[PDB]
Structure formats: C-alpha cells, structure tokens
Amino acid sequence: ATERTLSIIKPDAVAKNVIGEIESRFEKAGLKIVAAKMLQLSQEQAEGFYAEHKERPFFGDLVGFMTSGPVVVQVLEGENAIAANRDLMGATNPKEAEAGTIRADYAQSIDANAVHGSDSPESAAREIAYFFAESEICSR
Amino acid sequence: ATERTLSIIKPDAVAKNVIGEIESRFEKAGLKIVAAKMLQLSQEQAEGFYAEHKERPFFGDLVGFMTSGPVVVQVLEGENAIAANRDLMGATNPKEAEAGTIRADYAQSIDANAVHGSDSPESAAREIAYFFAESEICSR
C-alpha cells in the first residue's frame, strides 16, 4: 500500500553538495518527495528527535554531528515507501552496506551515513509528525 | 562575486519527479543549495510573488499554473549565482532554450517552464525576502 516515511539528507551529504544525486535515487526508485525543508537543527530539535538514544554512548556525537550543519528533512511517499527507503539506503553502517546503496556510495562512518530513513510504520508516523505539520505535507 | 538568488522548481518539474536531476545541475555547476522548502502556493501567495504582473492579461494563467501543484522554493548561492542560474535554466521559452539547459531538457512549453530564477540582483533580494527569513538561509 502507498506509505509515507521520513527521510533526512544529513550534514555530510548536504555539505558534499550531493543533494540532487540523493533525491534522484529516491525519485528513480518510485518515491515522491511530498514535503521538504532545509534547516540547521537546534540542540533541542536534534535531541528531541533522537530521544530514544539519550542513554547510548554515541548520543553526544550523534547530536553533535546532526547539528553540525544544515540538513534536509522531508517526507517520501510511494508504494511500500517505508521498506523501499530502507533498501535504497542500505545498512546503517556504510561498511556493511551493499554496493550501489546510498550509504555505501555516499557515507564515511556509521555516524556520517549520509541519510536517515524511518524503520517502521510506527516510527515513520512519529518522525513525520516531529518535523512536519500535516498541512505542510503536499499531496500528489 | 559570490551571491544569492531565488530559484523555484515549478509544479510541472515537481510533478515529473525530476527534483534531484534539476538540483544536480545547480550543484555540479558550483552553486550550493542554502535554503529550500516544498510548498503548495495559495492564490494569495502566488499573487503576492507575482504582484508586478497583476495588471497583465496572463496574470490569471500564471497564478493558475503556479498554484496547480507543489513547488520547491529555494535560494542558490555561489559565484555570480544570479547570472549563473539564468544560464543553466536557459531561455524562458523551452522551444528556444539551448540543448543542455534545464528548460530545454525538462520543460514542455512557455507555460510550464519547469524552473524560475531571479533576473537581477534587485529582484533577487526582493524574491528571497518574500519566501525566506534570513534565519532559514544556511550559507556554507
């Protein structure tokens, strides 16, 4: 069924000025961009989003990285979009990602892994509601 | 000569899902995407942006088209970004636009140009102010 998931082009990717190349992967794969915006995450924003990692030993570096430069947050919509976005991105750790995935082709470390995607329907709904008001999501 | 300019990816380009391809032109040319968001322009927002053409006979069609689906408004930044952006878009009329420019490669007709770009330094400052707060522009 058609779905919506949250996708973020991270600071490393946006600083490489490869936003176009990444958006083209999503589009070529059949996903549509239905909302997007570029912003520099505040400390509070980054922490509120990644709240479930508050206690992990990487939290401080994650929030640091995710706030280190501007990103693009967006909503991708398409058939089976949530799982499709995961297969497109590849394994969270670029060393374990198969050739041709976004992470294998664009990332440096498990931290700077170029993009984020929601990992379930429950997390998608939560993550879209975090960055976007419904009336911002432009249907088509 | 580093400058900023307003770029818009229009409802026709968005509808074709070629956001990334258009974006890659700008990026591979040396320009950086320093602000962006997808919007569904309301009547009053389009009329506001095109206030100058309010007395014209096409005004109706222009606004009609620019509100017909989602767009991406953005600011490009880099060396003579204003002139550079206009080179990449090519002639306003796709039919006359040279091979290899955005409008020649993506646009159907004069009506559905695929893209908008500021024509001048004065209209850039006006156009950028209309859509973005300075706090949304992230120079890098």
Coordinates of C-alpha atoms in Angstrom, one line a residue:
Chain A
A1 CA 0.0 0.0 0.0
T2 CA 1.2 3.5 -0.5
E3 CA 3.1 4.9 2.5
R4 CA 4.9 7.9 3.9
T5 CA 8.2 7.8 5.6
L6 CA 10.7 10.4 7.0
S7 CA 13.9 10.8 5.2
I8 CA 16.8 13.2 6.1
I9 CA 19.7 14.2 4.0
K10 CA 22.4 14.6 6.6
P11 CA 25.1 17.4 7.1
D12 CA 27.9 15.4 5.5
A13 CA 25.8 14.7 2.4
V14 CA 24.4 18.2 2.2
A15 CA 28.0 19.7 2.6
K16 CA 29.2 17.4 -0.3
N17 CA 26.5 19.2 -2.3
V18 CA 25.2 15.8 -3.4
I19 CA 21.5 16.6 -2.5
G20 CA 20.4 16.2 -6.2
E21 CA 22.1 12.9 -6.6
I22 CA 20.4 11.6 -3.5
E23 CA 17.0 13.0 -4.3
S24 CA 17.3 11.3 -7.8
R25 CA 17.8 7.9 -6.1
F26 CA 14.5 8.3 -4.3
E27 CA 12.7 9.5 -7.3
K28 CA 14.1 7.0 -9.8
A29 CA 13.1 4.3 -7.3
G30 CA 9.5 5.4 -7.4
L31 CA 9.3 7.5 -4.3
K32 CA 7.9 11.1 -4.4
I33 CA 9.0 14.0 -2.3
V34 CA 5.7 15.3 -0.7
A35 CA 7.3 17.7 1.9
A36 CA 10.8 19.1 2.4
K37 CA 12.8 21.8 4.0
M38 CA 16.4 22.7 4.7
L39 CA 17.3 23.7 8.2
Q40 CA 20.0 23.7 10.8
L41 CA 18.8 21.5 13.7
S42 CA 18.9 23.1 17.1
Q43 CA 20.3 21.2 20.1
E44 CA 16.8 20.7 21.4
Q45 CA 15.4 19.6 18.0
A46 CA 18.1 17.0 17.4
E47 CA 17.8 15.7 21.0
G48 CA 14.0 15.6 20.9
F49 CA 14.1 13.6 17.6
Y50 CA 16.8 11.1 18.8
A51 CA 15.4 11.0 22.3
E52 CA 15.3 7.1 22.4
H53 CA 19.1 7.2 22.2
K54 CA 19.5 9.6 25.1
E55 CA 21.5 6.9 27.1
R56 CA 23.7 5.4 24.4
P57 CA 27.4 6.1 24.3
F58 CA 27.1 7.8 20.9
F59 CA 24.2 10.2 21.7
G60 CA 26.6 13.1 22.2
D61 CA 28.4 12.6 18.9
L62 CA 25.1 11.9 17.1
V63 CA 23.5 15.2 18.3
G64 CA 26.8 17.0 17.6
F65 CA 27.0 15.6 14.0
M66 CA 23.3 16.1 13.3
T67 CA 23.6 19.7 14.4
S68 CA 27.0 20.3 12.8
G69 CA 25.5 21.8 9.6
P70 CA 22.3 22.1 7.7
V71 CA 20.2 19.1 6.7
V72 CA 17.2 18.4 4.5
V73 CA 14.2 16.8 6.3
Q74 CA 11.5 15.5 4.0
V75 CA 8.6 13.1 3.6
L76 CA 8.8 10.4 0.9
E77 CA 5.7 8.8 -0.4
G78 CA 5.2 5.8 -2.6
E79 CA 4.1 2.2 -2.7
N80 CA 5.7 0.3 0.2
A81 CA 7.8 3.5 0.8
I82 CA 9.0 2.7 4.3
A83 CA 10.7 -0.6 3.4
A84 CA 11.6 0.7 -0.1
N85 CA 13.5 3.6 1.5
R86 CA 15.4 1.2 3.8
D87 CA 16.5 -1.0 0.8
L88 CA 17.6 2.2 -1.1
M89 CA 19.7 3.5 2.0
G90 CA 21.4 0.2 2.7
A91 CA 22.8 -1.0 6.0
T92 CA 23.1 1.7 8.8
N93 CA 26.8 1.2 8.8
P94 CA 28.3 2.0 5.4
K95 CA 31.0 -0.9 5.8
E96 CA 28.1 -3.4 5.9
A97 CA 26.1 -1.7 3.1
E98 CA 25.9 -3.4 -0.3
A99 CA 27.4 -1.6 -3.3
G100 CA 25.1 0.8 -5.0
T101 CA 23.1 1.8 -1.9
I102 CA 23.0 5.4 -0.7
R103 CA 25.1 4.7 2.4
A104 CA 27.8 2.5 0.6
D105 CA 28.2 5.2 -2.1
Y106 CA 28.0 8.4 -0.1
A107 CA 29.0 7.8 3.5
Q108 CA 32.2 7.9 5.6
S109 CA 31.3 6.3 9.0
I110 CA 28.4 4.9 10.8
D111 CA 27.9 8.4 12.2
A112 CA 28.1 10.3 8.9
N113 CA 26.0 7.8 7.0
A114 CA 24.6 10.4 4.6
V115 CA 20.8 9.8 5.1
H116 CA 18.2 8.7 7.6
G117 CA 15.0 6.7 7.0
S118 CA 12.3 5.7 9.4
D119 CA 12.5 2.0 10.2
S120 CA 8.9 1.0 10.8
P121 CA 5.3 2.3 10.2
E122 CA 5.1 3.4 13.9
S123 CA 8.4 5.3 13.8
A124 CA 7.5 6.8 10.4
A125 CA 4.3 8.4 11.8
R126 CA 6.2 9.6 14.8
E127 CA 9.1 11.1 12.8
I128 CA 6.9 12.8 10.2
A129 CA 4.8 14.3 13.0
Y130 CA 8.0 15.6 14.5
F131 CA 9.2 17.7 11.6
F132 CA 6.1 18.4 9.7
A133 CA 2.6 19.6 10.4
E134 CA 0.0 17.7 8.3
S135 CA -1.0 20.9 6.4
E136 CA 2.7 21.1 5.3
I137 CA 2.6 17.7 3.6
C138 CA 1.7 18.5 -0.1
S139 CA -0.3 15.6 -1.6
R140 CA 0.2 14.5 -5.2
Chain B
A1 CA 31.4 37.8 -6.9
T2 CA 29.6 35.3 -4.5
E3 CA 25.9 35.9 -4.5
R4 CA 22.4 34.5 -3.7
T5 CA 19.5 34.0 -6.0
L6 CA 15.9 32.7 -5.8
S7 CA 15.2 29.5 -7.7
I8 CA 11.9 27.8 -8.0
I9 CA 11.3 24.2 -9.2
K10 CA 7.8 24.5 -10.7
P11 CA 4.7 22.4 -10.5
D12 CA 5.4 20.6 -13.8
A13 CA 9.0 19.6 -12.8
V14 CA 7.9 18.5 -9.4
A15 CA 5.0 16.5 -10.9
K16 CA 7.6 14.7 -13.1
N17 CA 9.7 13.8 -10.1
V18 CA 12.9 15.3 -11.5
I19 CA 13.7 17.4 -8.5
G20 CA 17.0 15.7 -8.0
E21 CA 18.1 16.0 -11.6
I22 CA 17.4 19.7 -11.7
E23 CA 19.1 20.1 -8.3
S24 CA 22.2 18.2 -9.5
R25 CA 22.7 20.7 -12.4
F26 CA 23.0 23.5 -9.9
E27 CA 25.3 21.5 -7.6
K28 CA 27.6 20.3 -10.3
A29 CA 27.8 23.8 -11.6
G30 CA 29.3 25.1 -8.4
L31 CA 26.2 26.6 -6.8
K32 CA 25.1 25.5 -3.2
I33 CA 21.5 25.0 -2.0
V34 CA 21.5 27.1 1.1
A35 CA 17.7 27.3 1.7
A36 CA 14.7 25.3 0.5
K37 CA 11.2 24.1 1.1
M38 CA 8.3 22.5 -0.8
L39 CA 5.1 24.5 -0.7
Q40 CA 1.7 24.5 -2.2
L41 CA 1.4 28.1 -3.0
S42 CA -2.1 29.6 -2.2
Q43 CA -3.8 32.1 -4.6
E44 CA -2.6 35.0 -2.4
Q45 CA 1.0 33.7 -2.1
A46 CA 1.4 33.4 -5.9
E47 CA -0.4 36.8 -6.4
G48 CA 1.9 38.2 -3.8
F49 CA 5.0 36.9 -5.5
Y50 CA 3.9 38.0 -9.0
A51 CA 2.3 41.3 -7.8
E52 CA 4.1 43.1 -10.6
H53 CA 2.1 41.3 -13.2
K54 CA -1.3 41.8 -11.6
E55 CA -2.4 44.2 -14.4
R56 CA -1.4 41.8 -17.2
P57 CA -3.7 39.5 -19.2
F58 CA -1.7 36.3 -18.5
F59 CA -1.8 37.0 -14.6
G60 CA -4.7 34.7 -14.3
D61 CA -3.0 31.8 -16.1
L62 CA 0.4 32.3 -14.3
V63 CA -1.1 32.1 -10.8
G64 CA -3.3 29.4 -12.0
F65 CA -0.3 27.3 -13.0
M66 CA 1.9 28.2 -10.1
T67 CA -0.8 27.1 -7.7
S68 CA -1.8 24.0 -9.7
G69 CA 0.6 21.8 -7.7
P70 CA 3.5 21.7 -5.2
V71 CA 6.7 23.7 -5.9
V72 CA 10.2 23.9 -4.3
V73 CA 11.3 27.4 -3.4
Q74 CA 15.0 27.8 -2.7
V75 CA 18.0 30.1 -2.6
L76 CA 21.1 29.2 -4.6
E77 CA 24.4 30.6 -3.6
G78 CA 27.9 30.9 -5.3
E79 CA 29.9 32.9 -7.8
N80 CA 27.7 35.1 -9.8
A81 CA 24.8 32.8 -8.8
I82 CA 22.3 35.2 -10.4
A83 CA 23.8 35.1 -13.9
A84 CA 24.9 31.5 -13.5
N85 CA 21.4 30.3 -12.6
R86 CA 20.0 32.0 -15.6
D87 CA 22.5 30.3 -17.9
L88 CA 21.5 26.9 -16.5
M89 CA 17.8 27.5 -16.9
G90 CA 18.1 28.7 -20.5
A91 CA 15.7 30.7 -22.5
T92 CA 12.3 31.4 -20.9
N93 CA 10.7 29.6 -23.9
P94 CA 11.8 25.9 -23.9
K95 CA 11.4 25.8 -27.7
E96 CA 14.2 28.4 -28.0
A97 CA 16.2 27.3 -25.0
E98 CA 19.5 25.7 -25.9
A99 CA 20.3 22.0 -25.5
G100 CA 21.6 21.1 -22.2
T101 CA 19.8 23.8 -20.1
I102 CA 17.1 22.9 -17.6
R103 CA 14.2 24.3 -19.6
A104 CA 15.3 22.6 -22.9
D105 CA 15.9 19.2 -21.2
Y106 CA 12.8 19.3 -18.9
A107 CA 10.1 21.9 -19.9
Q108 CA 7.1 21.1 -22.2
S109 CA 6.2 24.8 -23.1
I110 CA 6.5 28.5 -22.3
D111 CA 3.5 27.8 -19.8
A112 CA 5.3 25.1 -17.9
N113 CA 8.9 26.4 -17.7
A114 CA 10.0 23.8 -15.1
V115 CA 12.0 26.4 -13.2
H116 CA 12.1 30.1 -12.1
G117 CA 15.2 32.1 -11.4
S118 CA 15.8 35.7 -10.3
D119 CA 16.5 38.0 -13.4
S120 CA 18.6 40.7 -11.4
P121 CA 20.3 41.5 -8.1
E122 CA 17.5 43.8 -7.1
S123 CA 14.7 41.3 -7.9
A124 CA 16.8 38.6 -6.1
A125 CA 16.8 40.4 -2.8
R126 CA 13.1 41.1 -3.2
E127 CA 12.3 37.4 -4.2
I128 CA 14.4 35.8 -1.5
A129 CA 12.9 38.1 1.2
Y130 CA 9.4 37.2 0.1
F131 CA 9.9 33.5 0.8
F132 CA 12.6 33.2 3.4
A133 CA 13.7 34.7 6.7
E134 CA 17.4 35.2 6.8
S135 CA 17.4 32.8 9.7
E136 CA 16.3 30.0 7.2
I137 CA 19.3 30.7 4.8
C138 CA 22.3 28.5 5.7
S139 CA 25.4 29.8 3.9
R140 CA 28.3 27.2 3.8

